[PDB]
Design a binder for these strands. Structure first.
Lengths: 50, 149, 98, 70
RNA sequence: AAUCCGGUUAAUAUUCCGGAACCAGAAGGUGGAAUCAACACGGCAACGUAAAUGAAGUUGGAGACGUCGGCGGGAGCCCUGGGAAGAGUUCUCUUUUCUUUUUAACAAACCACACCCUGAAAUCGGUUUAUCCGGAGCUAGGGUAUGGUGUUUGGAAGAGUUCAGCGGCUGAAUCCGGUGCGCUCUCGACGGCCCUUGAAAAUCCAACGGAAGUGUUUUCACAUCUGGUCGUACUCAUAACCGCAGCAGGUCUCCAAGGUGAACAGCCUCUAGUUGAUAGAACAAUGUAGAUAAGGGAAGUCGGCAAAAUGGAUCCGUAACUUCGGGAUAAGGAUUGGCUCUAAGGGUAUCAACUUAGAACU
């Protein structure tokens, strides 16, 4: 909610940063097995449960 | 041309709702270019955005009906859906009558028409509901004054 | 006491209306005390010049009423689109185009 | 938030080091309002006579920053 | 402990900007008061004053309290009489219909249930809507206290709002009043209820006591300085939560316009919001949800199940039985519109409110 704790702010701030697509230059590296982010998360579908 | 944000900014600037915001249909391109609140304020000054007036809620019929009912109309048996106590409680009728009777009794005692003995007698008579209205107390006071004199 | 004036310089210059029709409409439609023809000495419409409509009243009177009556015959003659009554000073109402 | 009815004390607060600026207000009803911004309060003085207002204005020390109607 | 207004952003605001305040703590300084009769005077008093030292120890108070019921005051909304600005309508009618007409925290002055004084009260009196009060000192006369969401200014018109002009700028207006079993919140004085009597602590104040003491004290008027960390977007729900979901479910609370009416009922509208839910075209059967039906009127069925009928208000009238409180709105009848009118019920000759009775006419 609007009333948060700083630990929750930190947890949300990391989780927001981890929920981003891959840089394109990553896919051009030799031997790269990454094609899309396996760990994407939508705010409706799967919850953080923190 | 999507202007939902231009209507939103106009409503905020004009201090109304979107139902009052009116934007010129013949100036869509210029309104689309306007994207900040300063631009919206320029549009309003130029006359391209106008706040529509409030819809009509005339009270002519209401005032006329109130004035006519004040003359004694629309108050028959078929026009009353609430019981008599609900329409005008007997508690406030009694409270009005007692305050009126006590006020006059104090006026007469201070004036000198009645003394403390007669005032207390009439005070308890009035509290006992002996006096139906101000005149009824008036005739009783005059009759008592004549009898004493 | 109080004085009200209606300027019609533009109307008389453009032959839109004549001061005769102004005076006649005002005199036969003035509803003082709810009845026309009750001018008496309290309120008198004193027309000076063929560009002015001046009313001098010894009782309370409304400039809004004057605008109301002026608006009446404007639509009666159906040119309300070209003319609008606007107030410049205290007790002054003049006709303006677009 | 501090109305002053004494001319001198208005002047003295004006000379006092806490004073930073003075303002002039000319109302339509023709009274002159001398407002004096200070550190903590705003001391305003209402005068009904123009020439007393004018002689008061020149009585303000020159170092004080006087501003006209805003 | 102590913050308000106006404004600003594409998105933040009691947080930013402009203006205007406030509280807590700290230090010395200016000014004023008291003081060698060390720790101020006045008033009969209730108490007042710009100040007017007070250690330890003790004690009191605030914080600090249920519930319901009316009654009184205030503020905001509602209603309303004029004024002024625009705008709506105008075949006819309408001195009219509608919008606008605003004033924050904070500072200052002013503003009568408890109490005091004089006094002695039975022809007992005062007094409330509600019967409480008085020789334990009534009424009455004069005081003291409490003092805001009241008033007058400051804030503050320079702001906000409306309107008319110019090429950002210039003109105006923002005014004067009434009302109430009205609503919302609050406040004051009371009342009732209980084998139910309706938190604590931090914090703050005061008192009794009298250590102690040119220099001393000063809860007095001024200015000076300072204020860390973390939360702050947005949704709060027929799409942001929980139900596998953009689920007809669930989920705490604040604000709350007018008309009809007893009414936060139903029905319609203003401000605000939405116009979302696959659509189109046709009217077949069977359906689902609603309507009406001649004559009969429960013959239908396990069964009046479903539906129907009744329904507000006013006057009349009301049984057996009863734990005497009820039964009871028993049952049973009459009545209701529109319009024109008188008749009362108040306030200070004029002024203001809807509540009843009766007459005709239709």
């Amino acid at each position: 909610p609007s009333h948060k704790s700083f630990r929750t702010k930190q947890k949300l701030a990391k989780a927001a940063r981890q929920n981003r697509p891959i840089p394109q230059w990553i896919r051009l590296r030799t031997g790269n097995t990454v094609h899309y982010n396996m760990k994407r998360r939508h705010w409706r579908r799967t919850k953080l449960n923190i | 041309a999507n202007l939902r944000t231009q209507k939103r900014l106009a409503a905020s600037v004009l201090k109304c709702g979107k139902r009052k915001v009116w934007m010129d249909p013949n100036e869509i391109s210029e309104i689309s270019n306007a994207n900040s609140r300063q631009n919206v304020r320029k549009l309003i000054k130029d006359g391209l955005v106008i706040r529509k007036p409030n819809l009509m809620h005339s009270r002519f019929r209401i005032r006329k009906t109130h004035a006519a009912k004040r003359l004694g109309r629309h108050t028959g048996y078929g026009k009353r859906k609430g019981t008599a106590e609900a329409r005008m409680p007997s508690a406030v009728v009694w409270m009005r009558r007692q305050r009126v009777l006590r006020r006059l009794l104090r006026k007469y005692r201070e004036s000198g028409k009645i003394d403390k003995h007669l005032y207390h007698t009439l005070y308890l008579e009035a509290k006992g509901n002996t006096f139906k209205h101000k005149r009824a107390l008036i005739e009783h006071i005059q009759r008592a004054k004549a009898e004493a004199n | 006491s109080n004085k009200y004036i209606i300027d019609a310089t533009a109307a008389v210059n453009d032959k839109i209306f004549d001061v005769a029709a102004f005076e006649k409409y005002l005199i036969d439609r003035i509803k003082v005390d709810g009845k026309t023809g009750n001018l008496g000495s309290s309120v008198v419409v004193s027309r000076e010049g063929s560009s002015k409509i001046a009313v001098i009243a010894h009782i309370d009177f409304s400039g809004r009423y004057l605008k109301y009556l002026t608006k009446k015959f404007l639509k009666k003659h159906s040119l309300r689109d070209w003319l609008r009554v606007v107030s410049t000073k205290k007790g002054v109402y003049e006709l303006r185009y677009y | 938030p501090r109305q002053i009815s004494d001319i001198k004390q208005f002047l003295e607060i004006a000379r006092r080091k806490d004073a930073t600026s003075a303002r002039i207000k000319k109302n339509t009803n023709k009274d002159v309002k001398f407002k004096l911004r200070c550190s903590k309060y705003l001391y305003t003085l209402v005068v009904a006579d123009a020439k007393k207002a004018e002689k008061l204005r020149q009585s303000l020390p020159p170092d004080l920053t006087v501003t006209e109607v805003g």
